[PDB]
Structures are given as C-alpha cells and as structure tokens.
Subunit: 174 residues, 2 copies
C-alpha cells in the first residue's frame, strides 16, 4: 500500500542468465548467514527481473528487514558486485503526502467524493468519515494518490473550490 515501497529494493549489475528463484535463494541465504532476520523463515517473498536492462526488484515480508538488506550493497554474486538501492519512489517519512479534505456537502457519498479526487489521477487510499450510528457523512475525508508527485497539483486545483453552498479545504493531513 503506502508502505509497499518500504518493502522493496532495486538491485543492479546482475549476472547474465540468472533466474528469479536463484536470486531469491541467494538473498535469503545471506540474510540468515548474517543473522539479519527478525523471525524464522524467508524475508524475500518475490523477485522480478528485467533481463535486457540487467536489473531486478526484491520484495520483502517486512519494513525492518528491507532496511537491514541495504547493508548488502557491493555483495558478490556469481563473480559480480551487486548494487543495492532504495526505489526512486521510497518514502523516508511515511504518510507525508496524505491529504485532508474538508468542507464537503453532507449529502455526498464515497464514490461521488472519489470522483472529485480522481480527476487528477488514481488513488492508493481513500476513506470518508461518517457517523456509524446513522451512516451520515461528517463532511471530511482522507486520501493518498498512487503517484505522490500529483499531490500538489491536486491541492492547487481543489483547495478553495466552490462546491455549491460551501468552500473546500484541501491540504496535507500532516
């Protein structure tokens, strides 16, 4: 989800011919050799490879273990020195591009509000706040966009928008 990119690493300079399973076994082995796991089992859940551009992505079962694996930068695999880095969309500070949406008309439902937000692009997370004892909107919501670079384009567009009877507040929830 949001934390998805806190559970992945980029791996460059991979050796010719190597398969996804062989990479998986190698990294699991190294994590156990160095005592870097936080529970029994295998930290790496999956591996995707681009053979043509000689790179792969690793996906881990946890955030703490993903961080630990960073210490393997420069490690040797079938003769070659691997390059380990964070994804370009890694969020050092999590939830920093989460938005608060305030001053919505109380009659508007989940999908209607979503439809206002998604004109700037797709969402990874969305919730509208309601009274559970009635089902009625309290008039605010929260969201995060798939592509965090769209965030500021959406604030510029929506903050202050006249929605019939009311004026929207749209800002980073912080």
């Amino acid at each position: 989800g949001p934390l998805g990119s806190a559970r992945r690493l980029y791996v460059g300079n991979i050796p010719f011919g190597i398969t996804e399973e062989a990479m998986m076994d190698f990294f699991n082995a190294q994590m156990r050799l160095g005592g870097l796991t936080q529970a029994p089992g295998n930290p790496v859940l999956a591996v995707q490879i681009n053979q043509d551009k000689n790179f792969a992505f690793l996906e881990f079962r946890s955030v703490d273990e993903t961080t630990q694996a960073m210490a393997f930068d420069g490690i040797i695999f079938q003769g070659q020195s691997l390059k380990i880095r964070r994804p370009h969309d890694y969020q050092p500070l999590p939830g920093a591009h989460k938005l608060f949406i305030g001053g919505l008309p109380n009659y508007l439902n989940d999908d209607q509000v979503k439809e206002l937000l998604t004109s700037f692009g797709p969402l990874k997370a969305f919730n509208l706040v309601k009274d559970s004892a009635t089902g009625l909107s309290k008039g605010y919501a929260f969201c995060e966009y798939v592509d965090i670079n769209v965030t500021d384009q959406a604030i510029a567009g929506l903050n202050g928008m006249q929605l019939g009877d009311k004026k929207l507040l749209v800002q980073r929830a912080s």
Copy 2:
C-alpha cells in the same frame, strides 16, 4: 456510563503501520518516565487499532491511571502529535462541574443570560434564580456544560470581568 468507559481513552492521529505492541510499549514507558504509574508493572493492558482511520483505544488496568494519562494529550510519537480524549460514552457524575454565575443585571431574562454562556459551548443544565411571587431576577444563575473541558474556559473568560457597572463572579458551585 454513568459508570461505563472508566478505563479507556481514545488516541487520534496514530502513525500508519504501527503495531499494537509498539504502541503499548510506548505508553507503558512514558507512564514510568513521567512518574504517572501508581504500582509496579504495566498500566496499559491492551490497545485496539483501526489502521484505516488512524485511531486506537487503550484499556488501562485502573481508573486513576486512565485519568492521569490524559496529561499526555499532544505528545509527539514518531513525528505525529497524539490526540488523547475520553470516549464519547464517558460522562462524569451529575453536577460534578456545576457553575455559579453572580453579578448579572437583574432586568435580564433567561435566554438573554443563556446567550453569554453558550458562546463557550452547549449546556446540559441551566437555571436563572427568580423571585417566585413576582418573577424578576435575583442576579445569579447556575449552569453546567456538555463538554466538561469547557468549564475551565468559561471561568477564565468570564470571572473578574466587567458587565455594565458590575464585575462578574464565575466559579465552581462547590
């Protein structure tokens, strides 16, 4: 209640991804460092998290320690300011926070006097003391606020203040 919800607090603005364990350790640690604990061992018994709406409820082992832990309202936890409140279900006992208002001009009626008090927030009780046979005010009133945290704000905003050629008195009724 009247006696319900004595050992639970609402915690708003929790960081996403955080565990029930990590939140438990944090609050148990703070109670000790802050000197709020009243006995050996752990004041916090359990935590329940809604990951999607970023809030939790803590259950404490004792009534007084739940009360003490309200002083943490605003504390920073992994970059986020925590919002600590009583549950909506919690209500203090009848008249716990009754207020006396003296020095009102006696030509003023109930609604006129009530208007000054409801500027601070809504009332669950009010009575302007009147001479029964005639009907005209004695110049003092009693009231009680729905939100009991308003009580202290009313006092600070009205006590010792000028109203005509009279200075108001606003204090707890007992």
